[PDB]
Each structure stands twice: as structure tokens, then as C-alpha cells.
Amino acid sequence: KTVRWCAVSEHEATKCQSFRDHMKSVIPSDGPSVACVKKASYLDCIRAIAANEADAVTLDAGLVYDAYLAPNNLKPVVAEFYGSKEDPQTFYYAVAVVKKDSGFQMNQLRGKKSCHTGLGRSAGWNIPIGLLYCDLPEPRKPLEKAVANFFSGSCAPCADGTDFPQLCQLCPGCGCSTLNQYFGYSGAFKCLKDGAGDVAFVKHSTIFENLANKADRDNYELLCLDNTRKPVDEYKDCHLAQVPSETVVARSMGGKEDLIWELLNQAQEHFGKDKSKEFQLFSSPHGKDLLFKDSAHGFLKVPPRMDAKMYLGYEYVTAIRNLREGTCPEA
Numbered sequence: 001k002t003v004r005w006c007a008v009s010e011h012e013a014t015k016c017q018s019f020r021d022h023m024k025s026v027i028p029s030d031g032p033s034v035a036c037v038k039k040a041s042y043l044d045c046i047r048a049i050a051a052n053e054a055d056a057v058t059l060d061a062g063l064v065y066d067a068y069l070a071p072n073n074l075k076p077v078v079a080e081f082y083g084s085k086e087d088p089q090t091f092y093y094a095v096a097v098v099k100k101d102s103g104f105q106m107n108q109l110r111g112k113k114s115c116h117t118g119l120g121r122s123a124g125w126n127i128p129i130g131l132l133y134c135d136l137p138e139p140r141k142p143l144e145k146a147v148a149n150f151f152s153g154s155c156a157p158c159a160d161g162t163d164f165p166q167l168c169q170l171c172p173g174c175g176c177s178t179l180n181q182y183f184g185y186s187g188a189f190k191c192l193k194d195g196a197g198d199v200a201f202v203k204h205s206t207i208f209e210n211l212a213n214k215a216d217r218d219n220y221e222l223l224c225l226d227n228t229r230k231p232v233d234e235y236k237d238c239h240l241a242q243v244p245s246e247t248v249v250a251r252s253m254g255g256k257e258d259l260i261w262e263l264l265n266q267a268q269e270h271f272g273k274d275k276s277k278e279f280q281l282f283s284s285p286h287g288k289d290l291l292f293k294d295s296a297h298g299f300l301k302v303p304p305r306m307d308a309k310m311y312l313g314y315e316y317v318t319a320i321r322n323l324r325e326g327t328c329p330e331a
């Protein structure tokens with residue numbers, strides 16, 4: 001009863017190893033176990049699982065779309081939840097963080113340098129670019145090029161740096177792993193902090209995860225859709241959108257989902273939020289959001305009938321779909 005977890009590169013690899021070793025000490029020998037398979041990007045993890053080389057990997061809802069597509073055909077099986085065990089949230093808010101006093105508003109993002117969690121991810125890409133692409137007087141709608149031209153240099157992890165070097169200007173190569181310091185929610189944040197980009201498309205918990213003190217966080221703001229700015233504390237009324245939970249995907253058939261649930265259930269039971277000091281499934285000295293998001297507080301089993309589209313919902317799938325085809329209101 002072994003679940004082959006897909007770690008994306010070194011840090012994740014290291015956490016996966018500790019995840020395997022610590023589970024071995026709390027799970028009876030006849031229980032689920034963790035086998036660590038290391039890959040270079042989430043995409044490879046998707047391909048590996050589809051090829052029956054790995055069994056599970058956690059993906060942002062946006063990337064759940066990709067995993068679904070044939071010949072992958074993966075499905076969401078266990079979702080992460082946030083907030084607290086006492087008030088679980090299977091969603092989060094996409095926010096546009098900026099430094100206080102940088103002056104620009106949402107409508108003045110053109111020519112700025114942007115930091116994205118990753119190409120095709122909910123908060124760092126789908127939401128912001130979605131609300132942006134069609135308003136573009138410019139019909140360079142094959143997205144990447146249009147975005148590369150809209151902003152004056154960015155970091156969009158997993159974007160093809162060869163065709164669009166503009167998209168990797170802030171993080172040369174657009175590394176698609178935590179080895180790239182500007183990867184993910186917190187990487188995109190560092191990109192802003194360091195002053196490499198003017199804005200960071202991340203989530204409502206991101207700043208709180210990186211800045212322990214209100215005084216420092218006070219030097220940042222959120223860009224609201226009505227072209228005004230709000231304090232990072234007020235994301236409820238200043239966020240770009242509410243997006244679905246990141247989730248663990250598996251093969252639609254022979255995915256070992258049940259075994260996956262067990263592993264993760266028992267895992268949260270022993271090393272969930274604030275359970276143990278010897279191991280934390282939701283944090284690591286090796287980095288942020290390795291394997292699972294630090295903001296997650298546990299997991300929820302996805303209903304058996306749910307395929308990726310039912311999970312993402314009609315509007316999001318349609319949006320992602322139009323996004324990738326540049327389908328815009330009118331034509």
C-alpha cells in the first residue's frame with residue numbers, strides 16, 4: 001500500500017523524504033506508505049502519474065484543468081482546505097499586492113513589471129490575466145505574447161522563456177520549481193519585496209505568511225477592481241476573485257485515490273496543523289508550500305463523482321478555456 005508522491009525538484013524531494021520517514025514512525029507496517037518520485041515540474045508529475053510512474057501530486061485548481069486533458073485524464077481526489085479546522089475554506093482570494101505609495105491603480109498596470117505565482121495558476125495567472133486580456137485594445141490575444149508586451153518584464157514560472165524572454169525577465173528561465181526563488185505565492189511576493197516587480201498576483205494569505213509584523217505589512221497595499229487601494233487586511237473587499245482549493249490529483253482509474261485519502265488523512269492526524277513538532281506537513285525549514293500549501297489546515301475527500309470540470313465549476317473551466325483561445329466578448 002504505497003502512494004508514489006511526485007515531488008517537484010530538490011526541496012520538495014527533501015520534504016517528501018521526511019514525509020515518508022515520519023509516516024513510517026506513526027503508521028502500522030500494513031498501512032499506506034510514501035514513495036518519493038522527483039520530477040522537474042508539475043507537468044512532468046502530471047505525465048508521470050498518467051504513465052503510472054507516480055500516483056499523486058498537489059496542483060493549483062487552474063493546473064487541475066491541464067491534468068484533466070487527455071491523454072493525462074487525471075482527477076481531483078483530495079482537496080486542501082484553509083482557514084481553520086473550525087471553519088474550513090475550500091477557496092481563497094486572488095489579490096494584487098503592491099507596495100504602499102507606488103501610486104498606480106489597477107487600470108494603470110500597463111508597462112509595469114509583474115510577479116506571478118506560475119503560468120496557468122489561479123491567482124498568479126488565470127484571474128489577473130483573465131480580467132485583463134479582453135480589455136486589451138491590442139488583439140495580440142495568444143496570451144503570452146500579449147502579456148509579454150503589456151508588462152515591461154515579468155516572472156511567470158513555467159512560461160517558455162525562449163519564445164517569451166519578457167516573461168522571464170524577473171526570473172531568468174522561468175524555472176518551474178522552488179529552485180527559482182520567485183516561484184509560487186511566496187516567490188512572487190519576494191519578487192515584489194526585492195523590488196524586481198511592481199505588483200504580485202498572489203493570494204490573501206501570502207503577505208501574512210512572509211511578514212510577521214503589521215508595521216512592515218503596512219508598507220504594502222492591495223489593488224482593488226474599482227481602481228482604488230486597500231490595506232492587505234481588507235482583502236475581503238479588495239481581491240480580484242474567489243478561487244477553488246488546490247488539490248491532489250490522480251488517475252481517473254487505478255488512481256489509488258482511496259489509499260491516497262488514507263495516507264493524507266492519517267498524515268494530517270499526526271502531523272496536521274500544530275499536531276507535532278517533529279514533523280509539519282504544512283511547513284518546512286526547506287521552503288514554503290513544499291508538497292502542500294503552508295496555508296492549508298487539512299484535507300477533504302473529493303466526492304467520488306467529481307471530475308475536474310465538475311470540480312472547477314462551469315464558469316472557471318469556461319474562463320480558462322476562453323483564456324487559452326483568447327475568446328473575447330464580441331468576437
Ligand SMILES: [Fe+3]
Pocket residue numbers: 060061121122123246
Ligand atoms: Fe493557487
